[PDB]
Structure 1
Amino acid sequence: AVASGSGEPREEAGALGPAWDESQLRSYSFPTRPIPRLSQSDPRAEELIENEEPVVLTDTNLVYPALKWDLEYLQENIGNGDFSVYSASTHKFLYYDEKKMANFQNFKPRSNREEMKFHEFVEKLQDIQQRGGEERLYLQQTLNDTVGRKIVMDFLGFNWNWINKQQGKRGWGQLTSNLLLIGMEGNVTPAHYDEQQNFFAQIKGYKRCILFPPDQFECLYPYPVHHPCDRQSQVDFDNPDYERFPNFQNVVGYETVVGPGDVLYIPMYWWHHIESLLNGGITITVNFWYKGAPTPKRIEYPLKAHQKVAIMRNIEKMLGEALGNPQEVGPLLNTMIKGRYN
């Protein structure tokens, strides 16, 4: 019906069959509806981006030259720089902010970061394959000037004309970075929101992206701002604790499967959960992050949900600073509302 999820799997050209099938998606408790897949030249697509709603653009050629990328070509050409590689005991990658790690002395990491050369990432990977199992790796590394010449040529051949025009038309700030992501089949990036605009350019393999609007904050229960998992959902999507998180039962997502050549606009403050399909082999993505447009001169009501999220964050941070201890934030907030506003 009007909940279709990712919709039917798309047919590859040349009668090559379905690129993926439903058996490759994980099972979750909530419904979803499709994110529209549109031509870059379609007015509707421009309309979505302007109104800060997700859209998959199928023909931008944004990273056309990178479509030839695989492990051998990258190992060959990407150079000798260090690469951040995250590892996990489970399919779920728990990212954490090392700087806030002191705020909760109690916190113990379930995801280790290791710096290593690209060829070492490739090896450890190969090792785990034949090994084999069960550790998972996810390379997540900003693209910098240490990259080899051929990678530089590829980068230069991205569709900067198109994306630069987007940046201009939306009044966004500057491109803050490109992130290279290379994951193992089954890898999951759990639901979280980012504060920057994102064009998610898919290169190799398929990723199922599940987005939730900023007005679903109440259903997704982010960690406290001072927590190392700031901006992530507390909810375990695999075993949701309806007692701690009752409104997760009301959550509705927007879902799509992106493949090579697709670009997903993930608007700032939109929650997103990203999974590399089961048994779909390695995945490669490059993200383009931009600072959002400056907040308007005179503020108009009613506020967007993302502005209320901003307010909440700011109150949290301010209490942390005023009280002199982030640990005291919750107890003051409780004192403030119990029998007064609840």
Structure 2
Amino acid sequence: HLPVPRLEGVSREQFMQHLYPQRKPLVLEGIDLGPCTSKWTVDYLSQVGGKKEVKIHVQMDKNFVYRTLPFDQLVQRAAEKHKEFFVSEDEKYYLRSLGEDPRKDVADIRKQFPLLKGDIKFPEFFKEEQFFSSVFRISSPGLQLWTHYDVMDNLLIQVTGKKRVVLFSPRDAQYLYLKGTKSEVLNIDNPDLAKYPLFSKARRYECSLEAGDVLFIPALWFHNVISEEFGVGVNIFWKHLPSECYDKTDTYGNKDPTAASRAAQILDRALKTLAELPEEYRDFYARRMVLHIQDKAYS
């Protein structure tokens, strides 16, 4: 239960030249985000944001179904056991902003919530060219989000309400039972070691974003976010690598850099060759392979 460092009065420069390079999670207390942290009450937020349709999600596994609703009702229901309901009386809601055409364009609080945007100052921790996306994350009290990872550097700004989040090192990948970018273990707290023995060797870092706190999540770091109370956050993705290194298709910040994806493909070719020797020689030379990859491309 390692804790992630909290730090006050950290500077633009201090961050970029001395903290950022450490490549480790870190929360930043007392940054100036503007008025937003002060005036984004459920009652204000509904008014300002508007009634544009936002794609909704309704401990989550598919035990959730997607819906849609007017932004203003999304928030108001997020706060509320909601009276009117898509599925249940004790429904829980969850927003994750997306562009107009989700497969074409990234989310961006500027373009999509202009009026609300003017209320928040994103930390100037990266260069304006490196920007990737800005995302509203509004969830209801208690919601539990599977443990995923993102390929962009991330700033998770907690604007309103509390929120627990626990993180894992990229190197605790093996113990994570990775189905793509998500991990199989839903309940982080008391995990059925029965079903997944390895999840226990994973060193977890924990921390709790209080309204106004900023959590930095380096590229590749694993993280579970549980909304202690109701609240709205925004996180900001940005390109750590030269812009050419990433996936063009990717408007979520989830697809590996092409390089990873390319070498992962030729890897499947090497295996298609190997596969034609009797299992026993195939086994042998596969292990001889991972031996190689470890000596040379590890740390």
TM-score (norm. length: structure 1): 0.64
Q: In structure 1, what is the equivalent of residue 183 of structure 2?
A: 233
User: In structure 2, what residue type is equivalent to 1:52?
Assistant: R
Query: Counterpart of 1:120 in 2: which secondary structure?
Result: helix
Question: Matched residues in 2 for 1:82 and 1:243: separation?
Answer: 42
Q: In structure 2, what is the equivalent of residue 174 of structure 1?
A: 130
Question: Matched residues in 1 for 2:213 and 2:181: separation?
Answer: 26
Contact (CA 8 Å) 1:45, 1:55: kept in 2 or not?
Answer: no
- 1:154 corresponds to 2:119: yes
Query: What CA deviation, in whole Å up to 9, does each residue of 1:268-298 have, x standing for no partner?
Result: 1000011111xx3x12101011011339x9x
Q: In structure 2, what is the equivalent of residue 33 of structure 1?
A: 2
Query: Counterpart of 1:210 in 2: which secondary structure?
Result: strand
Out of 274, 278, 287, which is 2:225 matched to? 274
Q: In structure 1, what is the equivalent of residue 47 of structure 2?
A: 76
Question: Matched residues in 1 for 2:15 and 2:57: separation?
Answer: 34
Query: Counterpart of 2:119 in 1: which secondary structure?
Result: helix
Query: For residues 258 and 85 of structure 1, do their structure 2 counterparts lie closer, same or farther at Cα, with a shift above 3 Å needed?
Result: same
1:135 Cα offset (Å): 2.0
Query: For residues 220 and 63 of structure 1, do their structure 2 counterparts lie closer, same or farther at Cα, with a shift above 3 Å needed?
Result: farther
Out of 12, 20, 25, which is 1:54 matched to? 25
Question: Matched residues in 1 for 2:211 and 2:54: separation?
Answer: 23
Q: Which runs of 5+ in 2 are unaligned?
A: 98-106, 246-255, 288-299
Out of 194, 201, 204, which is 1:253 matched to? 204
Q: In structure 2, what is the equivalent of residue 338 of structure 1?
A: 283
Query: For residues 262 and 215 of structure 1, do their structure 2 counterparts lie closer, same or farther at Cα, with a shift above 3 Å needed?
Result: same
TM-score (norm. length: structure 2): 0.72
Corresponding pairs, count? 255
Question: Matched residues in 2 for 1:337 and 1:240: separation?
Answer: 35
Question: Matched residues in 2 for 1:48 and 1:210: separation?
Answer: 20
Q: CA RMSD in A?
A: 3.5
Question: Matched residues in 2 for 1:173 and 1:242: separation?
Answer: 44
- 1:286 corresponds to 2:234: yes
1:84 Cα offset (Å): 1.9
Query: What CA deviation, in whole Å up to 9, does each residue of 1:217-237 have, x standing for no partner?
Result: 1111110xxxxxx20112233
Question: Matched residues in 2 for 1:215 and 1:117: separation?
Answer: 41
Percent identity among equivalent residues? 24
Q: In structure 2, what is the equivalent of residue 27 of structure 1?
A: none
1:201 Cα offset (Å): 0.5
User: In structure 2, what residue type is equivalent to 1:259?
Assistant: E
Query: What CA deviation, in whole Å up to 9, does each residue of 1:5-42 have, x standing for no partner?
Result: xxxxxxxxxxxxxxxxxxxxxxxxxxx11111102426
Question: Matched residues in 1 for 2:204 and 2:264: separation?
Answer: 27
Question: Matched residues in 2 for 1:206 and 1:260: separation?
Answer: 6
Question: Matched residues in 1 for 2:173 and 2:215: separation?
Answer: 21
Query: What CA deviation, in whole Å up to 9, does each residue of 1:304-327 have, x standing for no partner?
Result: xxxx9997755545567x69xxxx
Contact (CA 8 Å) 2:42, 2:76: kept in 1 or not?
Answer: no
1:74 Cα offset (Å): 1.2
Question: Matched residues in 2 for 1:273 and 1:123: separation?
Answer: 24
Contact (CA 8 Å) 1:79, 1:146: kept in 2 or not?
Answer: no
Contact (CA 8 Å) 1:176, 1:289: kept in 2 or not?
Answer: yes
Q: In structure 1, what is the equivalent of residue 290 of structure 2?
A: none
- 1:119 corresponds to 2:119: no
Question: Matched residues in 1 for 2:218 and 2:176: separation?
Answer: 17
Q: Which runs of 5+ in 1 are unaligned?
A: 1-31, 95-108, 224-229, 298-307
Query: For residues 63 and 216 of structure 1, do their structure 2 counterparts lie closer, same or farther at Cα, with a shift above 3 Å needed?
Result: farther
